[PDB]
Amino acid sequence: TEDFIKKQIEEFNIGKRHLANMMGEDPETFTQEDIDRAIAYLFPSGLFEKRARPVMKHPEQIFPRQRAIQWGEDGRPFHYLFYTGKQSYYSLMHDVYGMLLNLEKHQVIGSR
Amino acid sequence: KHLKFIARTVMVQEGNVESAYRTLNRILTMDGLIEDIKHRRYYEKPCRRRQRESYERCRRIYNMEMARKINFLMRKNRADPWQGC
């Protein structure tokens, strides 16, 4: 839940400070890359699957971005296309269609 | 008893015998004479003939209705005017 995510964020901040203390670096300038290097040094793992090695990333990345329930206490969903079951995809399609309509109003090499 | 070289007669145009024969065969087929001869080679019993005629009539009616339906529905076979919705 959202409160669980807040608790995880607080725990991650405290752990980041503790890891900066352990590695003897400034907690205020301890980037995510420093966190990863410190974790790899303190908890070495030769497992080939990188997703299986120890990780202490931000909760925004460790937890799936599917988020908690998509409605508040009142139960009203936040997104107006929620009942489509694919609110992200259909919102993206709606935005693209609006862009095409605006293009109608007004009027390959290094990418895949 | 009738006068000859009038019925089922096609004049050959510039020696094109094959085209004249094709025209004559098409005329006979359009008039159903070829199918008449093929059916008259052996006796078709009246019940069998009635069944065949009824089946042919039903098949023609169904084919005409299906053709009309396909022609009516193919008017919508165009580019999607509301793509992305």
Contact of A85 with B73, CB cutoff 8 Å? no
Residues on chain A touching B85 (C-beta within 8 angstroms): 93, 97
Residue with tokens 């023609």: B60
Strand, helix or coil at A32? helix
Distance CA A61, CA A43 (A): 20
Which one of A92, A95, A96, A97 makes the best mutation probe of the B interface by having the most chain B beta carbons within 10 Å? A97
Specify the experimental method: cryo-EM
Distances (CA, A) of A95 to A105, B25, B43, B78: 15, 65, 74, 25
CB atoms within 10 A of CB A16: 19
Contact of A70 with A82, CB cutoff 8 Å? yes
Secondary structure element (H or E) that encloses residue A49, with its range: none
Expressed in Å, this structure's resolution amounts to 3.0
Locate the chain B residue with the closest alpha carbon to A99.
B84
Question: In this structure, what token pair is assigned to residue B82?
Answer: 């509301």
Distances (CA, A) of B37 to B28, B29, B47, B53: 10, 11, 19, 16
Question: In this structure, what token pair is assigned to residue A45?
Answer: 């793992």
* Last residue before each gap in chain B (C to N over 2.5 A): none
- Nearest Cα to A97, choosing from B82, B19, B27? B82
Contact of A104 with B82, CB cutoff 8 Å? no
Secondary structure element (H or E) that encloses residue B27, with its range: helix B17-30
Residues on chain B touching A100 (C-beta within 8 angstroms): 84
